[PDB]
RNA sequence: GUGAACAGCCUCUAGUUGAUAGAAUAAUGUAGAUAAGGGAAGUCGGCAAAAUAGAUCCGUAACUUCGGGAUAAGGAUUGGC
RNA sequence: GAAUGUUACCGCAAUAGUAAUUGAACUUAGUACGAGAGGAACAGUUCAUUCGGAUAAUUGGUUUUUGCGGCUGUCUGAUCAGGCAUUGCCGCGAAGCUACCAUCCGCUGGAUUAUGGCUGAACGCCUCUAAGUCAGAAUCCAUGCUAGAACGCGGUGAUUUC
RNA sequence: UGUACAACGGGGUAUUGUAAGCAGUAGAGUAGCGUUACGAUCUGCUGAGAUUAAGCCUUUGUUGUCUGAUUUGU
């Protein structure tokens, strides 16, 4: 008979199965639709999540109760040194779907990206792409033929890039390699662009800019095996119920004589792939800017890195992206930043961000000081300093 | 409201509150006032004749620098002797 | 964090502040108003037997007398001896509103302090006479 | 946007940090930290807690009255915006901070004078009081030097 | 946001679920107020309706005039002990929970409010703002 | 309320989208593309300065390795009867 | 020794050091705890926990077989020198 | 997780699942409409409810960091430094975890239902229907989102001297 | 056999709240002859001292380490 009181089900059936993601780098499942008359452009970028901090924004939002008023907001900092273009892949349309027809690599690759092709790098003879690089000799036949094949048959063109992980504070030396779709001119112009950009760097400010909505694709933080109460958000059973209260009391009271797929069960929590959308870029910071932590209202010459560095990350010494709010993944995880799949019609996508202040107090405690000069000036002369 | 209706309408038009400022120079209207400088609020230092007050403070500083406000041996002991005593005391404590 | 501190100094179990009690004792009119209160049914002792220093009602005059003869009351009396520690002290220790804080200290030492001391002397001798 | 000082320890209170308590007489108590807020709730005395600026000024650990400490005060009468006046104020703030730091250092130096004299007297008394240990030290010195010689 | 309220209301931490007793901050003769319903409350199984500062509730007088007693009336929450975030950048709280008696249009029954009134409630309700002596 | 998939709201959105929002998207695209070109030119100039210090038919097989591999694979599929398109 | 105390806690004489181990620190348990704001809205039912607690002084109703009820209830206090 | 040369990197997408919801507010406006009393909506904007997915800058909770300090009783002659009290107890406490007790984010193309039509017979009138055809619901199928067939597949690197 | 790796050390960044030792003429008083003796506590040297990656950041120092096992072919 019918359930007496209505309640919505616990959890979302479209995020199934709640299994560990197959890779630590979450896949981009859809790129923006290509417009051929537009100039050539990358559709995505790769970065590393460094941490969070706090800002003060001078908000312009007509019709809002906080119009012409200051708001304090959380932001996420992503460390984004330039990526290095190393290859190009062509894709053809078939009745079974998109098929990669051919791949062309650049003549010279760094050991940073060569490490991605090894499980035991220190023992290997490092022979990867050595015979391939010999195909660039004597007027480059083979290379030219495969570029001609891409031009003649490809309906989609993607470019193989990799991170420069040696510019981050990470202990990992092996770089991250990814395909990034080229949306822009014709197929021929896409291929010419890729061939021209082989072994060259693309910086994040030649892909994004401030006041733009982007999407964050990443694997969430893992939490191991989890019970139903916290994995699914179900209600705890009364105190000292026999055989536990972090359970669902009845997993089936009705006919099918099985456990339904729609019933909450204990299992893996976290380390899933997620694509969150519409995060506004608050700042595109440059790595050689001495005051990239400073605003027009705060005249302190300071960088973005908080005192003592980001906890478990280190210091920001490269270009960075500051997006408001939070993104999937924990600090130092590789994240993919994607351009919007559609033209956002909300006015927040039109707002221009004007930051009044960026928090650089220490995250390793209840940080009270923004700079070491400020801490020293407030405290005064110490016993060791005399 | 006519300006608003021709620009964006209600809830889309963003009015500039600085346009009615009565300042000495009209180019100063769209100027950002700084608020923080190295842990200090600019507003509670902002004052007319702060330049004269700073000058008086500097005269005080010069008077101290002339007076000598900013500027190993004992009776019965030389420098090597006090060093020897210090080393022996450190040895004893250790 | 601990249970003792939580259940004693929970916000819903807060007590009157020392600067407020200092202001209560500073003026004679406040002293007389707090000494002579209307018969209130919801206060202990029908609103009578009120110690101003501790901001506390007692059920009876004998309870008030035994309270005045105690280390708790003497502790509160010692606490109310100095400057009442406004936000001006913290601002001045930071180096801000220094002239304002110094003027306030001068006023306490010159006028408000000795008047409070005289009121406290008169209040103590009245409590001795009536108790 | 304004930097406040903690009601308990006078530390700077930046936006977002700490917590504010409003008393029924409309007085705001801003606290930089949970530590200071819990001390206030337990009703501890900031002038007796040694880690606070109120105590340090009360006990004379740092100079409290100086001509550099009078420039910063809450301005309740505004002045019209002037670009060059703002520029002069910004230069003056750095100059005042530099002079205040120099005078703070000098104050700590004057407070700590006599330390070397005390240390030397203590060392002399200890050396005078330990003749046997010094003899052991000399034997160790002579044996180590003879080992180096041979 | 309630009838008589002026504009939208952004989310505030909830401090007063049904069954709470707050003080009466006006001068209409009531001493405390017992919350029995919250206007604008949503619906979810097992979840208690709760009120924050600037909300309208239905309340009974437990202590005060017998004329005020045995009647269910609207009240507007002007103070709460649960800390809440201000968008300027501070979490804050009051000493007590407090409300004032109103009619369904949000007009004040009493003539004055003793103690501070939260800015959010004052800005939401113009009659509370008119009867307020202290706005934080 | 109107759902996210409500026709009249989506029609109003499309009318709004064809105008000022698409204008903003296009202008940002032009700015970013100019920055990308300048980035390439700057890399060329740096490499040039550094080197100053130092000084088509697609028919047939892709290569002989590809020829041997695909021929062997197709022969193996014929022999083991594992072809998707041939018997 | 503490303390009213053959209580609990720590120690001297004497006596043991036995009870399968090692490494890890998911869920669910068993045993024990803490929690903002609210304060029984939970539940068949305040079940369970929490709150109280030693001693000194002030004070203590109905009812009553006049013996009680009574540690009724309600208050002030407690270190060290 | 065996096996279809070995080993490695980048990918495709059959199939299965799928997700958002509701209320108010400004403007339209004191307008249409109305003797009056009253009193809308589309287009343009701003918040919130329920749900969902993350997240930890900040606030709060938590403490074997037994990190720092203190307290009772006893024991180590005292000081010092410590032990025990089934984590002894009290205050603070980073890190980690975590809360509508904290913050962020959650869309747009095709085909349709009722119904309103166009052209038009049946039936020399007529008729949205018979043939043909236009719109149109929170619906359907997709776009987007999750997994990826361990017996679905593609592209690419290296491929062994006792 | 190297922006190599590690163990320590250094510097930051955080946490607590002023170490041990010595001194004073600060200390309710009491005992003996203005003085000495006991004396909770207070003050100074001293934001001192302790801790700080175990899932914090960093590093021109010191000392070491870089080595075995097994299997795979169109
Ligand atoms: Mg932190
Ligand atoms: Mg229920
Ligand atoms: Mg609680
Ligand atoms: Mg009930
Ligand atoms: Mg019930
Ligand atoms: Mg009884
Ligand atoms: Mg499908
Ligand atoms: Mg509309
Ligand atoms: Mg959650
Ligand atoms: Mg002990
Ligand atoms: Mg017709
Ligand atoms: Mg597979
Ligand atoms: Zn008292
Ligand atoms: Zn503080």
| Domains recognised in chain A with CATH numbers | 16-81+203-220+270-384 (2.40.30.10), 82-202 (3.30.1430.10)
Cα–Cα separations (whole angstroms), residue A138 to A191, A197, F59? 21, 21, 20
Other residues' Cβ atoms within 10 Å of the Cβ of residue C105:
15
User: Which residues in chain C (30-89) have CB-CB distances under 8 A to chain D?
Assistant: 79, 82, 85, 87, 89
| Orientation angle between helical segments D131-149 and B79-93, nearest 10 degrees | 100
Phi first, then psi: give them for residue E84, nearest 5 degrees.
-140, 155
Asked if the C-beta of C13 comes within 8 angstroms of chain E's C-beta atoms, the answer is no
H or E stretch at E84: strand E84-86
d(CA A206, CA F30): 11
Q: Tell me the pairing of strands B36-37 and B40-41.
A: antiparallel
- What are the tokens at A191? 């291929």
For residue D144, being part of any structural domain is answered with: no
Q: So where are chain E's domains?
A: 15-136
d(CA E56, CA A214): 40
Could you tell me where the beta strands, DSSP code E, fall in A184-331?
Answer: 201-202, 213-219, 222-226, 267-270, 273-285, 320-324
Q: Residue A306: which of A357, A360, A374, A358 has the closest Cα?
A: A360
Q: Residue E59: which of E41, E79, E77 has the closest Cα?
A: E77
> Are residues D47 and D71 located together in one domain of the fold?
no
Helix, strand or coil, per DSSP, at residue A180: strand
| Orientation angle between helical segments A143-153 and A187-197, nearest 10 degrees | 150
Asked if the C-beta of B69 comes within 8 angstroms of chain D's C-beta atoms, the answer is yes
Residues from E in contact with C at Cβ < 8 Å: 81, 93, 95-96
- What are the tokens at A359? 């928090």
The reply to whether the CB atom of residue A346 sits less than 7 A from any atom in nucleic acid chain I is no
- What are the tokens at A163? 């991170």
Ligand 8 centre distance from Cα of residue F13 (Å): 11
Task: Please list every residue in chain B whose beta carbon sits closer than 8 Å to the beta carbon of residue D10.
Answer: none
Cα–Cα separations (whole angstroms), residue A267 to A24, A228, A230, A261? 19, 8, 11, 13
d(CA A381, CA A384): 8
- What are the tokens at D41? 């709730």
Ligand 11 centre distance from Cα of residue D27 (Å): 82
d(CA A26, CA E58): 51
Could you tell me where the beta strands, DSSP code E, fall in A165-228?
Answer: 177-183, 201-202, 213-219, 222-226
Q: Residue written as tokens 């700015």?
A: F31
d(CA E82, CA A101): 63
> Are residues D51 and D71 located together in one domain of the fold?
no
Which residues touch A191 (CB under 8 Å, ≥6 apart)?
Answer: A88, A90, A147, A150, A151, A154, A157
d(CA B22, CA D137): 83
Cα-Cα-Cα-Cα torsion A37, A40, A43, A46, nearest 10 degrees, comes to: -170
> Are residues D80 and D93 located together in one domain of the fold?
yes
Q: Tell me the pairing of strands E113-117 and E132-135.
A: parallel
Do the Cβ atoms of D33 and D78 come closer than 8 Å?
no
The reply to whether the CB atom of residue B9 sits less than 7 A from any atom in nucleic acid chain H is yes
d(CA A355, CA A59): 9
Q: Residue written as tokens 């976290």?
A: A270
d(CA D98, CA C101): 24
Residues B38, B42, B46, CA angle at the centre, nearest 5°?
145
Catalogue the long-range contacts made by C115-122 (C-beta closer than 8 Å, 24 or more residues apart). C115/C26, C115/C27, C116/C22, C116/C25, C116/C26, C119/C25, C119/C26, C119/C27, C119/C28, C119/C31, C120/C25, C122/C31
> Are residues D39 and D89 located together in one domain of the fold?
no
Assess whether chains C and F touch, using the rule of 3 or more C-beta pairs within 8 angstroms. no
> Are residues D89 and D121 located together in one domain of the fold?
yes
- What are the tokens at A273? 């792939």
Q: Residue written as tokens 């202040």?
A: A357
CB atoms E81 and C14 under 8 Å: no
CA→C1' distance for C28 and I49 (Å) = 49
d(CA A309, CA A316): 8
Q: What burial class does residue B23 get, using C-beta atoms within 10 Å of its C-beta: 0-12 exposed, 13-18 middle, 19+ buried?
A: middle
Helix, strand or coil, per DSSP, at residue A93: strand
Question: Residue D19's beta-bridge partner residues?
Answer: D31, E91
d(CA A101, CA A155): 10
> Are residues D70 and D48 located together in one domain of the fold?
no
Q: Tell me the pairing of strands E21-24 and E98-101.
A: parallel
CA→C1' distance for F83 and H1 (Å) = 28
Instruction: Give the nearest nucleotide to A93, CA to C1'.
Output: H12
CA→C1' distance for A364 and H80 (Å) = 35
Of D81, D93, D124, the CB nearest to B31: D81
Other residues' Cβ atoms within 10 Å of the Cβ of residue F32:
20
Declared resolution, Å = 2.4
Which residues touch A257 (CB under 8 Å, ≥6 apart)?
Answer: none
- Greatest distance between any 2 Cα atoms in chain B: 94
Residues C95, C101, C106, CA angle at the centre, nearest 5°?
140
Helix, strand or coil, per DSSP, at residue F44: helix
Q: Residue D30 belongs to what domain range?
A: 2-65
Helix, strand or coil, per DSSP, at residue A174: coil
The sign of the dihedral angle between the CA atoms of A115, A121, A122, A124 is negative
d(CA A11, CA A339): 28
> Are residues D47 and D7 located together in one domain of the fold?
yes
Q: Is E64 left (phi over 0), alpha (psi -120 to 50) or beta?
A: left
For residue D140, being part of any structural domain is answered with: no
H or E stretch at E92: strand E90-94
Could you tell me where the beta strands, DSSP code E, fall in chain D?
Answer: 4-5, 12-13, 19-22, 28-31
Question: Terminal CA-to-CA distance of chain A, rounded, Å?
Answer: 83
Q: Residue written as tokens 């001896």?
A: C81
> Are residues D85 and D113 located together in one domain of the fold?
yes
User: Which residues in chain A (42-81) have CB-CB distances under 8 A to chain D?
Assistant: 54, 56, 70, 72
Task: Tell which of D15, D40, D65 closes a domain.
Answer: D65
Cα–Cα separations (whole angstroms), residue C118 to C26, C36, C121? 9, 19, 5
Catalogue the long-range contacts made by B54-58 (C-beta closer than 8 Å, 24 or more residues apart). B54/D92, B54/D95, B54/D96, B57/D67, B57/D68, B57/D96, B57/D99, B58/D95
CATH superfamily name and code, E15-136: Ribosomal protein L14/L23 (2.40.150.20)
Q: Residue written as tokens 């190009």?
A: A88
> Are residues D72 and D124 located together in one domain of the fold?
yes
d(CA F75, CA E46): 69
- What are the tokens at A185? 């001119």
Total domains in the fold of chain D = 2
Ligand 4 centre distance from Cα of residue E58 (Å): 19
d(CA E18, CA E37): 6
Could you tell me where the beta strands, DSSP code E, fall in chain A?
Answer: 41-42, 44-59, 69-79, 83-94, 97-105, 156-162, 177-183, 201-202, 213-219, 222-226, 267-270, 273-285, 320-324, 334-339, 355-358
Q: Residue written as tokens 């006078």?
A: D10
H/E/C letters for each residue in C75-87?
A: HHHHHCCCCCCCH
CB atoms C5 and D42 under 8 Å: yes
Is the bond leading into A17 cis (omega within 30 degrees of zero)? yes
Closest-approach residue (CA) in chain C for D65: C98
Asked if the C-beta of D26 comes within 8 angstroms of chain E's C-beta atoms, the answer is yes
CA→C1' distance for D25 and I13 (Å) = 39
Asked if the C-beta of D33 comes within 8 angstroms of chain A's C-beta atoms, the answer is yes
Ligand 7 centre distance from Cα of residue E84 (Å): 45
Q: Which residues surround ligand 13, an ion (CB under 5 A)?
A: C 51, 53-54, 73
CB atoms A7 and E88 under 8 Å: no
Question: Terminal CA-to-CA distance of chain F, rounded, Å?
Answer: 59
User: Helical H runs in A56-133?
Assistant: 111-114, 130-133
Q: What burial class does residue C14 get, using C-beta atoms within 10 Å of its C-beta: 0-12 exposed, 13-18 middle, 19+ buried?
A: middle
d(CA F45, CA F51): 10
Phi first, then psi: give them for residue D89, nearest 5 degrees.
-60, -40
Which residues touch E24 (CB under 8 Å, ≥6 apart)?
Answer: E30, E31, E32, E33, E61, E64, E98, E99, E100, E101
For residue D39, being part of any structural domain is answered with: yes
> Are residues D13 and D60 located together in one domain of the fold?
yes
Q: How many CA within 13 A on the CB side of residue E131?
A: 24
CB atoms F32 and A145 under 8 Å: no
- What are the tokens at A356? 């009044």
The sign of the dihedral angle between the CA atoms of A117, A123, A129, A133 is positive
> Are residues D49 and D73 located together in one domain of the fold?
no
> Are residues D57 and D88 located together in one domain of the fold?
no
């Amino acid at each position: 008979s019918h359930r007496k009181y209505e309640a919505p089900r616990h959890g979302h059936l479209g995020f199934l199965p709640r299994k560990r993601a197959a890779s630590i780098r979450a896949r981009v499942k859809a790129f923006p639709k290509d417009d051929r008359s537009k100039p050539v452009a990358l559709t995505s970028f790769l970065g590393y999540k460094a941490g969070m901090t706090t800002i003060v924004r001078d908000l312009d939002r007509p019709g809002s109760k906080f119009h012409k008023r200051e708001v304090v907001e959380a932001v996420t900092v992503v460390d984004t040194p330039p990526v290095v273009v190393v290859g190009v892949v062509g894709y053809v349309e078939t009745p079974r779907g998109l098929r990669s027809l051919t791949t062309v690599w650049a003549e010279h690759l760094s050991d940073e990206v060569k490490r991605r092709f090894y499980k035991n790098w220190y023992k290997s003879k490092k022979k990867a792409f050595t015979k391939y690089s010999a195909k660039y000799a004597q007027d480059g036949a083979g290379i030219e033929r495969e570029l001609a094949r891409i031009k003649k048959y490809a309906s989609v063109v993607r470019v193989l890039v990799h991170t420069q992980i040696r510019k981050t504070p990470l202990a990992q030396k092996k770089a991250h390699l990814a395909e990034i779709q080229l949306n822009g001119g014709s197929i021929s112009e896409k291929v010419d662009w890729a061939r021209e950009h082989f072994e060259k760097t693309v910086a994040v400010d030649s892909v994004f800019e401030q006041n733009e909505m982007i999407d964050a694709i990443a694997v969430t933080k893992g939490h191991g095996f989890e019970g139903v109460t916290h994995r699914w958000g179900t209600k705890k059973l009364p105190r000292k119920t026999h055989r536990g209260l972090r359970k669902v009391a009845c997993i089936g009271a009705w006919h099918p004589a099985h456990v339904m797929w729609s019933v909450a069960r204990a299992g893996q929590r976290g380390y899933h792939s997620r694509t969150s959308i519409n995060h506004k870029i608050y700042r595109v910071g440059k790595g050689d800017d001495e005051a990239n932590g400073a605003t027009s209202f705060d005249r302190t010459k300071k960088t973005i890195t908080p005192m003592g560095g980001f906890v478990h990350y280190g210091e920001i010494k490269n270009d960075f992206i500051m997006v408001k709010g939070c993104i999937p993944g924990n600090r130092k995880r590789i994240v993919t930043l994607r351009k919007s799949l559609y033209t956002n019609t909300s006015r927040k996508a039109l707002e221009e961000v004007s930051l009044k202040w960026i928090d650089t107090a220490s995250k390793f405690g209840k940080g009270r000081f923004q700079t070491p000069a400020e801490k020293h000036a407030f405290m005064g002369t110490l016993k060791k300093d005399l | 409201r006519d300006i608003e209706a021709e620009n964006g309408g209600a809830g889309v038009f963003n009015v500039n509150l600085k346009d009615k400022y009565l300042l000495e120079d009209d180019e100063w209207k769209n100027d950002i006032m700084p608020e923080i400088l190295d842990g200090k609020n600019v507003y509670d230092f902002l004052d007319p004749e702060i330049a004269a007050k700073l000058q008086a403070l500097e005269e005080e500083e010069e008077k101290l620098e002339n007076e000598g406000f900013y500027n190993e041996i004992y009776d019965g002991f030389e420098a090597s002797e006090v060093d020897d005593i210090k080393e022996k005391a450190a040895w004893i404590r250790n | 964090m601990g249970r003792y501190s939580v259940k004693r100094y929970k916000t819903k179990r807060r007590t009157r502040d020392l600067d407020l009690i200092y202001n209560d004792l500073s003026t004679k009119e406040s002293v007389q108003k707090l000494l002579n209160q209307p018969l209130d049914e919801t206060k202990p002792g029908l609103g009578q037997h009120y110690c101003i220093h501790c901001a506390k009602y007692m059920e009876t005059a004998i309870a008030l007398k035994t309270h005045l003869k105690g280390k708790v009351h003497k502790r509160r009396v010692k606490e109310l001896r100095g400057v009442p520690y406004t936000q001006e002290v913290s601002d001045a220790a930071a180096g801000y509103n220094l002239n304002k804080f110094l003027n306030r200290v001068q006023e306490i030492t010159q006028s408000v302090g000795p008047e409070k001391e005289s009121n406290e002397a008169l209040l103590k001798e009245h409590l001795d006479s009536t108790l | 946007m304004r930097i406040y000082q903690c009601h308990f320890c006078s530390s700077p209170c930046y936006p977002g940090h700490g917590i504010m308590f409003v008393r029924n007489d409309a007085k705001e108590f801003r606290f930089c930290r949970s530590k200071c807020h819990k001390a206030f709730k337990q009703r501890r005395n900031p002038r007796k807690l040694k880690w606070t600026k109120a105590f340090r000024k009360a006990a004379g650990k740092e100079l409290a009255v100086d001509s550099t400490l009078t420039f910063a005060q809450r301005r309740n009468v505004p002045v019209r915006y002037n670009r060059e006046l703002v520029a002069t104020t910004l230069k003056a703030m750095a100059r005042i901070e530099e002079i205040r730091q120099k005078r703070e250092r000098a104050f700590y130096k004057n407070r700590m004078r006599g330390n070397k004299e005390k240390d030397f007297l203590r060392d002399k008394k200890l050396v005078e009081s330990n003749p046997e240990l010094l003899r052991i030290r000399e034997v160790e010195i002579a044996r180590k030097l003879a080992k180096e010689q041979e | 946001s309630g009838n008589g309220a002026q504009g939208t209301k952004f989310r505030i931490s909830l401090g007063l679920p049904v069954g709470a007793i707050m003080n009466c901050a006006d001068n209409s003769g009531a001493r405390n107020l017992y919350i029995i319903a919250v206007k604008g409350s949503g619906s979810r199984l097992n979840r208690l309706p709760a009120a924050s500062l600037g909300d309208m509730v239905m309340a009974t007088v437990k202590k005060g005039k017998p004329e005020l007693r045995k009647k269910v009336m609207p009240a507007i929450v002007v103070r709460q002990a649960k800390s809440w975030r201000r968008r300027d950048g501070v979490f804050l709280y009051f000493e007590d929970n407090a409300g004032v008696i109103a009619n369904p249009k949000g007009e004040m029954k009493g003539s004055a409010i003793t103690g501070p009134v939260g800015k959010e409630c004052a800005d939401l309700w113009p009659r509370v703002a008119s009867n307020s002596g202290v706005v934080v | 309320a109107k759902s996210l998939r409500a026709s009249s709201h989506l029609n109003a959105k499309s009318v709004k989208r064809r105008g000022v929002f698409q204008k903003a998207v296009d202008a940002r695209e032009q700015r970013i593309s100019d920055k990308l070109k300048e980035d390439l030119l700057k890399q060329k100039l740096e490499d040039l300065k550094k080197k100053e210090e130092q000084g088509i038919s697609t028919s047939g097989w892709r290569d002989g390795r590809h020829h041997t591999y695909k021929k062997a694979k197709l022969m193996k599929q014929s022999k083991k009867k594992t072809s998707f398109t041939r018997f």
